[PDB]
From a paper:
In this study, we determined the three-dimensional structure of L. pneumophila effector protein VipD, whose function in macrophage was unknown. VipD contains an N-terminal lipase domain which shares sequence homology with patatin, a phospholipase in potato tuber having phospholipase A and lysophospholipase A activities. We show that the C-terminal domain of VipD tightly binds to the GTP-bound form of Rab5 and Rab22, blocks their interactions with three downstream effector molecules, and inhibits endocytic trafficking in mouse macrophages. In summary, the structural and biochemical analyses identified VipD as a signal blocker disabling the key endosomal regulators Rab5 and Rab22.
Full-length VipD was crystallizable, but the X-ray diffraction of the crystals was too poor for structure determination. Various attempts were made to improve the crystal quality, and the successful trial was to employ a truncated VipD lacking C-terminal 46 residues and to dehydrate resulting crystals with 30% glycerol at −20°C. The structure of this truncated version of VipD, referred to as VipD(1-575), was determined at 2.9 Å resolution. VipD(1-575) folds into two domains which are roughly discernable: the N- and C-terminal domains, designated as VipD(1-316) and VipD(316-575), respectively. Ala316 is at the boundary of the two domains and located in the middle of the structure lengthwise. The two domains interact with each other mostly through secondary structural elements. β1 and β2 of VipD(1-316) form a “mini” β-sheet together with β11 of VipD(316-575) in the C-terminal domain. Likewise, β10 of VipD(316-575) is a part of the central β-sheet in the N-terminal domain. In particular, the two residues of cPLA2 (Ser228 and Asp549), which form the catalytic dyad, are closely superposable on Ser73 and Asp288 in VipD. Moreover, the Gly196-Gly-Gly-Phe-Arg200 sequence, which forms the oxyanion hole in cPLA2, is also present in VipD as a Gly42-Gly-Gly-Ala-Lys46 sequence at spatially the same location. Likewise, a similar groove covered by loop β10-α14 is present in VipD. These features indicate that VipD is a catalytically active phospholipase A2. VipD(316-575) contains ten α-helices and two short β-strands.
Author numbering:
A (entry chain A), B (entry chain A): -1 to 558
């Protein structure tokens, strides 16, 4: 990860990041997996946050959560995000999301038929308190360095909260206590009166700013520090996006920038949708609203796209399943290969036809790429919600669960021959790869050839752009020679790799190669003679899924 | 330490703090020392910060610095404060303060005959960078948890700074490199151009706030975390007070509230005196100026007055030495005892006179008290400075050194008998005391009697306020009985303790006792008879220094 400040230098000196993970299977193969996921971004969308439950379950089962360091979100995303961040556990997170009387979450204390937002913010505080209190007690006896000052502040805040709730006759020791509280409206009113009594800010003698009475973003840091090493991961670094109505742009609140901001206050603001709530208002007097109504979620600063999962839920069924989108493309790819093959009589000998363009397939992934975008169809669950249809809910949930699983699966790819893996990744992204031990040997032997090949690919492009095609064939034959002799690849493997290389050159040249090939074949047809170009083209149209598969059969027999 | 948020509860439940430190000497005595000093507050005053050098030397020799967790300051104080905070070492801190061409620190880039402030802020950045870079390299090889993200950000900032300075042909590896830089004006101009090129803020795609390119208050946290335990104390938690000209009140910037604030920018602002600099301006567009021109320094939030040293320098010689102020009072105290004794013929038998009041000595410390206020006379060194008189400088320095030493000495007191110590401290502040091991036995035996005595003191007051003096004598005799029999104190010790008790009762009763005594003596004189009141009064006027001394002779022979 690189901070935007590093871009201010005249001569940047790229640091080493990790975007890939090459490993060697017990099977003896090589697998290209994405790097461990560090950040999670939950896009806004209103009450479609019931789905996030499914998405979390997926990450849970797959053990992806534990290695998260950052969590950012807006609207429903923001809440979910904060519950994750505050180190709550799935069991309870699940119990919360599905169990909160969001219907009674919308106070009437508002005006003009809109909630004031104070109640929602109050339930959040009760939650953060309850969960942070449990962690606070997970700390050991010592408590030495400035960890004595932090421990005190937290202990005191939790103290303040309880004194206020006790007097109110409210007692919360766990998730259920909270959920039950939301069901009683008389109790909810006691909550508001109780917690609303706590001031927004506290200034001192000379009007200096004092510690926020409420649990803040910064307290998450205070808590993380105090905890034992093996438990520090439980608490995440939370970012909350919001729309600053006054400045009319989004504003992000986080533990590293606005550590003195109330967790509950920010999350409530992030969900202060203009349709359901009256705008919020910060200390500066600027008006705040739902973080998802003006623009999309900004990325987490210190991380790389490759390390961050972005979940974005939307109403209706605008999006299509991932697996059914893969097989739809795969089928089209195979269809195109067939189209090229079945057209050989007209293409080479004679007939009335005209070839299409790889441009009707330029939506082909020629290099390894990680897609970290999780799209979820929420169905009939839109921003405005009053319908907890036992169905529409269970559908949106598992619908979100499946999506996380699908995208999570599209990450790992497995190749048979290390040269293949490396050629797909590209010598470029090879340096930003986290290579394994058992792999290092063959990988670097293979990268040597990969470089020799790359140089040739590059040269072909270079020479064509200068309008010199005299050596295109020769260079191509050379690349094949390297794959056969130097790399020693089976006939099938070689065929697949060479196919890939041909494709990558076409890409790098922006179809300048394919045009040449087609022209050569065409002239050859006119001369009533064969052409070396035909073989290369048949390889160009090979189906990419095959090129990457471990089929062990030629493109022709690839079914799927 | 208690946060002001804990004051919001209906029923506060006082936490245990530490304001005292009872220990047992090898001599076999008991000493009442102040608690370890946690915070240091350096009041504003303009360029009188040359004196702070002396004050630091004192703390250094006395090992008081190492246990500091917080450092707060304004104006000259702010700079000094930040250099301390950034873990710099005395040797260099000394070399810096005295060696900076503050004369050439005041750029001409300003307007209306005032510095713009950009240069001063630039030298500060060069300093923070240089010192933080050294610490950054003190970190070990591992760097594991989110300590990888921090380490990166710092490494990058330092990187940015150097790239800018290198291009400028500037190289700083130590304090001297910096000092020398300040001597060349052509070099200083290169610095400004170089560092001024770095933007104030950096916003992203959607206008989200991004990491400050400059070293921030928050980076101090980043650095502290990264360092090895035994070295975490090197880096202090910095607060910087400033005057917000626009809002016309002071504003405090700190690592826990405004972690994203530039250290250099804040310190420069804190010293942006209206006479020498044009006002500063923050992101909100509010105007900023010297933190010491509008009001005094506010206290560090989580700490107790008892744990914080406050240094406040002022021009001229308004203040008087501490030792010469003690002996001046001591002499007056002894003089008063003499006045009471030499007046006994008139007081008891007959003569024309009229007694003064303990109110001419109510400036007498009846209970143990810690004075943490260090006052320094800066002499002819005022806010506006152009006079680095080799003298006036050395005078202000050592003048500040002596003061820290004096006040630092007035802290420890040593008593012979544990009951004495406890009676001076007061059963009240006894609970907030950090008692030692070897002491616990006798202390709690002694506190039992102390309580019995307190109850009696209290009772005397209680009964007098209800206009009942019938048992004043009896109660007093009882207290003496407890000191003689129960505590078993030498005649001298007993006399001293009883004196103290009599005084404390007078205080608690607001001279209601002394009035009674005097009246009793007066009536007794009229009846031509002696009075028990005379003894008590002679004890009331005993000199407090004696009462607390280990003289081992009666008040009469106390010289000093």
């Amino acid at each position: 990860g690189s901070m935007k400040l590093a871009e201010i230098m005249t001569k940047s000196r790229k640091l080493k990041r990790n975007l890939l993970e090459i490993s060697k299977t017990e099977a003896g193969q090589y697998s290209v997996s994405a790097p461990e996921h560090k950040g999670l971004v939950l896009s806004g969308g209103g009450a479609k946050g019931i789905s996030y439950l499914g998405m979390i379950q997926a990450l849970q089962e797959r053990g992806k959560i534990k290695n998260l360091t950052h969590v950012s979100g807006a609207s429903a995303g923001a809440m979910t995000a904060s519950i994750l961040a505050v180190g709550m556990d799935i069991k309870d997170i699940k119990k919360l999301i599905e169990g909160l009387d969001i219907t009674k979450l919308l106070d009437n204390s508002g005006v003009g038929f809109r909630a004031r937002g104070d109640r929602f913010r109050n339930i959040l505080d009760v939650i953060y308190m309850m969960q942070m209190k449990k962690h606070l007690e997970s700390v050991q006896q010592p408590i030495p360095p400035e960890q004595q000052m932090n421990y005190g502040i937290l202990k005191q805040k939790i103290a303040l909260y309880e004194d206020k709730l006790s007097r109110a006759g409210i007692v919360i020791n766990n998730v259920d206590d909270i959920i039950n509280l939301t069901k009683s409206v008389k109790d909810l009113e006691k909550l508001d009166k109780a917690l609303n009594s706590i001031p927004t800010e506290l200034k001192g003698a000379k009007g200096e700013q004092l510690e926020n009475p409420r649990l803040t973003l910064g307290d998450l840091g205070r808590l993380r520090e105090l905890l034992p090493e093996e438990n520090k991961h439980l608490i995440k670094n939370l970012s909350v996006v919001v729309t600053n109505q006054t400045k009319h742009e989004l504003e992000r609140y986080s533990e590293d920038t606005t550590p003195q901001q109330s967790i509950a206050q920010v999350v409530q603001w992030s969900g202060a949708h203009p349709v359901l709530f009256v705008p919020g208002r910060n200390a500066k007097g600027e008006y705040i609203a739902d973080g998802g109504i003006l623009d999309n979620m900004p990325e987490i600063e210190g991380l790389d796209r490759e390390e961050v999962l972005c979940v974005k839920a939307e109403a209706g069924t605008a999006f299509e399943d991932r697996v059914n989108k893969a097989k739809q493309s795969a089928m089209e790819a195979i269809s195109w290969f067939k189209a090229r093959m079945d057209s050989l009589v007209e293409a080479t000998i004679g007939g009335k036809w005209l070839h299409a363009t790889s441009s009707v397939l330029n939506r082909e992934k020629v290099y390894y790429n990680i897609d970290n975008m999780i799209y979820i169809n929420t169905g009939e669950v839109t921003t405005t919600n009053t319908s907890p249809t036992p169905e529409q809910r269970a559908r949106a949930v598992k619908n979100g669960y499946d999506q996380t699983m699908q995208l999570l699966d599209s990450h790992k790819q497995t190749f048979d021959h290390p040269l293949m893996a490396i050629l797909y990744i590209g010598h470029d992204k090879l340096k930003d790869a986290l290579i394994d031990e058992k792999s290092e040997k063959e990988i670097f032997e293979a990268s040597a050839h990969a470089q020799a090949i790359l140089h040739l690919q590059e040269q072909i492009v270079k020479e064509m752009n200068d309008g010199d095609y005299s050596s295109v064939q020769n260079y191509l034959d050379q690349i094949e020679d390297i794959l056969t002799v130097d790399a020693k690849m089976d006939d099938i493997q070689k065929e697949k790799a060479f196919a890939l290389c041909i494709k990558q050159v076409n890409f790098l040249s922006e179809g300048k190669l394919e045009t040449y090939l087609n022209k050569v074949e065409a002239e050859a047809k006119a001369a009533a003679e064969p052409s070396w170009a035909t073989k290369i083209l048949n390889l160009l149209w090979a189906p990419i899924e095959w090129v990457v598969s471990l089929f062990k059969g030629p493109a022709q027999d690839f079914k799927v």
